[PDB]
């Protein structure tokens, strides 16, 4: 922001949006899968209890 202006600062910020949104989406996908794994483990633990 402190170097460019809107017309092209937006061009760069859009690249950063793409990158960071992709990273956060990957993290959330991994967390969903891991949470499903933990759900299976907790169901097993409850059955064992």
């Amino acid at each position: 922001l402190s170097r460019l202006d809107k017309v092209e600062a937006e061009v760069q910020i859009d690249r950063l949006i793409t990158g960071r949104l992709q990273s956060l989406q990957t993290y959330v996908t991994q967390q969903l899968i891991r949470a499903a794994e933990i759900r299976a483990s907790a169901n097993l633990a409850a059955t064992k209890m």
Binding site: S2, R3, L4, D5
Partner: protein
């Protein structure tokens, strides 16, 4: 300067330890083209190199 260097021997100078003002240079009359990359012409008055 009285004489600009030849491209065959283009001249180079270094600027350090000073306060600048690029607004007066950007809007001055004689300048046919004043184009920047990686920084905005209006923004130069708020960075410190």
């Amino acid at each position: 300067a009285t004489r600009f260097a030849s491209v065959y021997a283009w001249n180079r100078k270094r600027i350090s330890n000073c306060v600048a003002d690029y607004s007066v240079l950007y809007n001055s009359a004689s300048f046919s083209t004043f184009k920047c990359y990686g920084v905005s012409p209006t923004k130069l008055n708020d960075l410190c190199f």
